[PDB]
Amino acid sequence: HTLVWGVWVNGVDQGDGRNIYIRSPPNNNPVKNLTSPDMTCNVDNRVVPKSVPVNAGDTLTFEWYHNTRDDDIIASSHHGPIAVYIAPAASNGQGNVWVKLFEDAYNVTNSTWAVDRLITAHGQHSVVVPHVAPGDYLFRAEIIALHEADSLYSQNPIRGAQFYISCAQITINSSDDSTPLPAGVPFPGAYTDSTPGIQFNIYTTPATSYVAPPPSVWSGALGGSIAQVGDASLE
């Protein structure tokens, strides 16, 4: 159970984005139905009044929280991966539009899941803004909690992989468009009951064997991190 509070751009806090530049759902409950329209941008997908200006090459940091800013972030039980996707905003997230910019699942070096490191990072994970066409975009940050993912939601709707999905409205101003955005995958649709990484038993199956759901990270993607960029306590 987690939500996005706002974003930072090059370590500068853009301020509380909830219902402002984040298409915030009404609460932190997960999405679990893989064929739900709610898989696009969570249960209240609509245009919000602001879009955060960035340029290609900026560091864009998403900041998550549980109940209040810079708290426990997400229950520690919620082990799983983190991904970020991008789509042109005019699509409203519909159709074959989502391109993956970031994946972090289980780090064998550190023996930690992305969610574990997100807690340590005070809810902060970042991407480099890619060199796509200037314009308005949706950045879809997705945490998958796997603690009940041994079951398919379609078999037992009390369980299943849990999707904490947050769409941020980002406007890319200065970009050379050296890597034009291609078509991508649909949400709902990209993840199905047979997709690797959706049904996974963290109690019985080693995390060293976990394969995150496709698609693969796009060749145009410039990278990211799971790390505290900004100190909310200084404000």
Ligand X SMILES: OC[C@H]1O[C@@H](O[C@H]2[C@H](O)[C@@H](O)[C@H](O[C@H]3[C@H](O)[C@@H](O)[C@H](O)O[C@@H]3CO)O[C@@H]2CO)[C@H](O)[C@@H](O)[C@@H]1O
* Numbered residues of the known binding site for Cu(2+): 1, 78, 164
Interface with ligand X includes 96 (CB under 6 A)? no
Q: How far is the CB of 78 from Cu ion (least distance, A)?
A: 6
Binding mask 98-137 for ligand X (x = CB under 6 A): ----------------------------------------
Site for ligand X in 185-204 (CB under 6 A): none
Q: Which does 32 bind (CB under 5 to 8 A by kind): ligand X, Cu ion, none?
A: none
For residue 95, CA distances in Å to 35, 82, 113 come to 13, 22, 30
| Pair type for strands 135-145 and 59-65 | unpaired
Residue 66 sits in the site that holds ligand X (CB under 6 A): yes
For 72-97, give one letter per residue: b (16+ CB within 10 A) or e: ebbeeebbbbbbbbbbbbebbbeeeb
Is residue 1 involved in binding Cu ion (CB under 5 A)? yes
Q: How far apart are CA 168 and CA 84, in angstroms?
A: 11
Among 18, 50, 147, 159, which residue sits at the site for ligand X (rule: CB under 6 A)?
A: 147
* Per CB under 5 A, 69 contacts Cu ion: no
If one counts every other C-beta atom within 10 angstroms of the C-beta of residue 138, the result is 24
3-state secondary structure of 135: strand
Rounded to whole angstroms, how far apart are CA atoms 89 and 87? 6
**Residues in 118-157 that interact with Cu ion by CB under 5 A:** none
Binding site residues, ligand X, CB under 6 A? 1, 28, 66-67, 75, 77, 147
Binding site residues, Cu ion, CB under 5 A? 1
